[PDB]
């Protein structure tokens with residue numbers, strides 16, 4: 001348990017430090033549309049790793065904060081700011097893939113570069129405003145131990161004499177809504193509309209090169225616009241060379257940007273679902289009144305839920321090295337940079 005957290009800090013600073021460097025090293029006119037959200041995700045994951053030496057020492061001494069009041073406020077604020085920001089970056093990535101693949105409006109009216117620049121400014125402004133009450137409510141002090149001080153959320157500042165639970169559940173449910181429920185629903189809607197257009201795959205002639213598009217079809221021969229290639233009558237031949245349906249190959253479009261988007265979302269959902277499910281169940285446990293044995297599990301699973309959420313911060317650079325070919329190409333170029341460095345030092 002303590003050795004695992006120490007490994008995350010080592011893989012986080014070097015991992016996210018590489019991701020941030022690879023995007024910045026790329027040319028001004030050679031940058032991808034998704035790169036603006038990739039760079040912002042790297043900044044969010046990097047600052048998330050900076051809060052680990054404050055959190056790991058706190059867990060070692062079993063809930064003890066020897067840093068201060070301002071450090072308890074800032075670290076807790078940065079943890080939640082980056083919690084919303086990383087989720088909003090994936091929302092931007094999914095919407096970027098939606099506007100490009102689906103295309104709801106005209107190509108000139110879409111403004112993909114403009115929309116991306118607007119979304120990145122709005123997400124960083126929202127993440128700071130939404131996580132703002134966290135910094136205000138967080139304060140250091142003795143709870144029961146007296147000799148050992150702990151950094152906790154003190155609801156007494158805004159709540160009345162009995163509405164202390166109401167604010168914990170009020171801010172708690174909204175955090176799951178803003179940070180997971182709303183972004184994941186947009187993520188699911190984007191993926192659904194993307195798969196909807198892809199559903200009817202293109203077929204190309206291996207003889208002449210006729211690119212059959214299911215959207216346009218072939219109304220000159222009899223194929224209605226919207227007919228799938230498999231739904232086409234068996235008597236139909238190529239309108240350019242007259243070859244059978246058996247001489248056509250399926251267009252397996254190498255959608256690399258969607259592969260980076262899906263993998264990052266799936267891994268995020270696997271690392272954010274146990275943290276958000278245990279939290280919501282604990283908040284609902286006081287209102288719905290769940291059994292004594294059920295609440296005992298959630299209290300012991302939660303410190304491990306915060307562990308797997310920290311894993312996601314250092315797991316992302318590994319995913320860029322397995323599915324993204326652009327990051328793999330810049331990695332080899334980084335060793336070539338070190339090869340010219342050793343060649344310039346001796347010549």
Ligand SMILES: COc1cccc(OC)c1-n1c(NS(=O)(=O)[C@@H](C)[C@H](O)c2ncc(C)cn2)nnc1-c1cccc(C)n1
Nearest residue numbers: 075076077079080083151153278279282298299302306309
């Ligand atoms: C803002 O970081 C903190 C700093 C110090 C202590 C903390 O506490 C565990 C957090 N913290 C908090 N506070 S909490 O809301 O008061 C929390 C204690 C809540 O009462 C609760 N829920 C579920 C159960 C079963 C019991 N009790 N919630 N999440 C995190 C967190 C931590 C690390 C990484 C991530 C992604 N998140």
Ligand SMILES: [Zn+2]
Nearest residue numbers: 205208238241
């Ligand atoms: Zn043909």
